[PDB]
From Swiss-Prot:
Annotated phenotype, changing residue 74 to K: In JMML; increases protein tyrosine phosphatase activity against CDC73
Cited function: Acts downstream of various receptor and cytoplasmic protein tyrosine kinases to participate in the signal transduction from the cell surface to the nucleus. Positively regulates MAPK signal transduction pathway. Dephosphorylates GAB1, ARHGAP35 and EGFR. Dephosphorylates ROCK2 at 'Tyr-722' resulting in stimulation of its RhoA binding activity. Dephosphorylates CDC73. Dephosphorylates SOX9 on tyrosine residues, leading to inactivate SOX9 and promote ossification. Dephosphorylates tyrosine-phosphorylated NEDD9/CAS-L.
Listed transmembrane segments: none
Enzyme active site: 422
Gene assigned in the entry: PTPN11
Name used for this protein in its record: Tyrosine-protein phosphatase non-receptor type 11
Effect the entry attributes to changing residue 59 to V: In JMML; also in myelodysplastic syndrome
Effect of residue 241 to Q: In NS1; increases MAPK signaling; increased protein tyrosine phosphatase activity
Stated consequence of mutating residue 466 to R: In NS1 and JMML; JMML patient also shows growth retardation and pulmonic stenosis
Tissue-specificity statement: Widely expressed, with highest levels in heart, brain, and skeletal muscle.
Recorded domain comment: The SH2 domains repress phosphatase activity. Binding of these domains to phosphotyrosine-containing proteins relieves this auto-inhibition, possibly by inducing a conformational change in the enzyme.
GO biological process, one term: ERBB signaling pathway
Organism the protein comes from: Homo sapiens
Compartment annotation: Cytoplasm; Nucleus
Pfam families per the UniProt record, alphabetical: SH2 (PF00017), Y_phosphatase (PF00102)
Length: 488
């Protein structure tokens, strides 16, 4: 589980939680209050609490004295499985016991302040057999289910810090109660089974009414509460990343612990006749395809081109500068303008470069060496103006770029997936892919369609780890879709 994350606690509350209710090896994670956008990993080690900083400017989670990761669940799973890796002075910190949160705020089914009539309305319009929710009653709670068709309300009593349905077991949290009756459903006298199948959808909005949702999420924030509910669903996305762990593939990853899922990785068949099949790249299939990948390493430039050629990709979206903050984000994998270069068995020519305000377009020609008939044009769209930290203050530039990328891809008959990359290939990459997926819904289906932003992100996140990194990018995605519909 992801119960070790406590969204609404202070460093003091965290210290007292570990020192009174935990042991040596106990830990929890929490958002930082001192600098929002950041996280803190509080660990109990020899009767004392250590608070460790986790940073995310949009590319990955960067734990002080540790490594860079795609999700907090990936970070926690790693350090709990691989010991001696986390260090203070250099003292080996061990994560042994997650100290669980009882706060139901980040749960999909928790609604807090809500009326039984409004809960009945939502379950009537947006609900199906098994749809349920938990809301505040006088210090008590209410479980409202849909069965068909009807709505049943079950009182949840709060007696001396424990929860019950009026008999049987007394739970230490609403989640323990909810989970219990999910596995062991309450049966009504006349045989009705109160099936807790799925939480009620609170995120799907009609495209045309996005402005109303943006306003509502901008009220004390709602964006933060919505994002942290999506974040909580990331414990379901811990798929294997075994291939990316192989000795032979270690130097093929830009970040040691940010790996591609095995079930979606782009497998390379070109094959020089040992382990010629790996690239830190994943296929992104909506519900037009993409490949989400990292910025090239000097040793992966060749694999990059074997992939572009294999997949029949005709468009590349680069969302980083080669160098940001004095650090190399992506090596130059393309030739200089008018030059011709050989990258292993692959040959590329930079025919022409066009510089627009927010980006450069490079017309590339790709072919396999010794076969002239294999030649195809690859359009490289390189976004140059993304801030080193955070998101652009206005989404127009990104929307204009994405519009051009869209129409180029659309004009090319039988073009393979769109290649999208930044540094790690999870934050800016995930942001551009998600904006593009949602704005494609409003392209085909028009302003009258239904859009569900965290449903889309979760779907993309099961395909590559940590796709869309921060709450800032998440807000940017809302702001981008809203600007598209406004200019429609
Ligand atoms: C259906 O579920 C799944 C089924 C099968 C595999 C996985 C799976 N895939 N990745 C991981 N990781 C990430 C990871 C692991 C190792 C290294 C690594 O470099 N190695 C290798 C040499 C030294 C060692 C080391 O660094 O100590 C780096 C990373 Cl990021 C974990 O932690 C992990 C921990 C508990 C269980 C599965 C894990 N799991 C899985 O999720």
């Amino acid at each position: 589980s992801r119960r070790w994350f406590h969204p609404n606690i202070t460093g003091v509350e965290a210290e007292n939680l570990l020192l009174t209710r935990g042991v040596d090896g106990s830990f929890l994670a929490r958002p930082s209050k001192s600098n929002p956008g950041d996280f803190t990993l509080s660990v109990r080690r020899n009767g004392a609490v250590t608070h460790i900083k986790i940073q995310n400017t949009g590319d990955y989670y960067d734990l002080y004295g540790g490594e860079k990761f795609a999700t907090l669940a990936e970070l926690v799973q790693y350090y709990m499985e691989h010991h001696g890796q986390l260090k203070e002075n250099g003292d080996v910190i061990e994560l042994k016991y997650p100290l669980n949160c009882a706060d139901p705020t980040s749960e999909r089914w928790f609604h807090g302040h809500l009326s039984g009539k409004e809960a009945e309305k939502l379950l009537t319009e947006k609900g199906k057999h098994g749809s349920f929710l938990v809301r505040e009653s006088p210090g008590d709670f209410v479980l409202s289910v849909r069965t068909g068709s009807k709505v049943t309300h079950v009182m949840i009593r709060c007696q001396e810090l424990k929860y019950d349905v009026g008999g049987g077991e007394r739970f230490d949290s609403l989640t323990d109660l909810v989970e219990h009756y999910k596995k062991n459903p309450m049966v009504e006298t006349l045989g009705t089974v109160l099936q807790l199948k799925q939480p009620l959808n609170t995120t799907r909005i009609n495209a045309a009414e996005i402005e109303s949702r943006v306003r509502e999420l901008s009220k004390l924030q709602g964006f933060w509460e919505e994002f942290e509910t999506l974040q909580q669903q990331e414990c379901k996305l811990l798929y294997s990343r075994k291939e990316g762990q192989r000795q032979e593939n270690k130097n093929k990853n830009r970040y040691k612990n940010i790996l591609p899922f095995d079930h979606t990785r782009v497998v390379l068949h070109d094959g020089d006749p040992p382990v010629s099949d790996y690239i830190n790249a994943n296929i992104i299939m909506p519900e037009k395809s993409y490949i989400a990948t990292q910025g090239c390493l000097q040793n992966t430039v060749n694999d990059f081109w074997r992939m572009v050629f294999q997949e029949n990709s005709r468009v590349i979206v680069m969302t980083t500068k080669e160098v940001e903050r004095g650090k190399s984000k992506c090596v130059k994998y393309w030739p200089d303008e008018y030059a011709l270069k050989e990258y292993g068995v692959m040959r590329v020519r930079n025919v022409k470069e066009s510089a627009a305000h927010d980006y450069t377009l490079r017309e590339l020609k790709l072919s396999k060496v010794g076969q002239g008939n294999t030649e195809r044009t690859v359009w490289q769209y390189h976004f140059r103006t993304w801030p080193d930290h955070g998101v652009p203050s206005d989404p127009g530039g990104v929307l204009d770029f994405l519009e051009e990328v869209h129409h180029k891809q659309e004009s090319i008959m039988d073009a393979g997936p769109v290649v999208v990359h930044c540094s790690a290939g999870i934050g800016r990459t995930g942001t551009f892919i998600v904006i593009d997926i949602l704005i494609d819904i409003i392209r085909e289906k028009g302003v009258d369609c239904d859009i569900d932003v965290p449903k889309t992100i979760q779907m993309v996140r099961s395909q590559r780890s940590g796709m869309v990194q921060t709450e800032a990018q998440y807000r940017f995605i809302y702001m981008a879709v809203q600007h598209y519909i406004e200019t429609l």
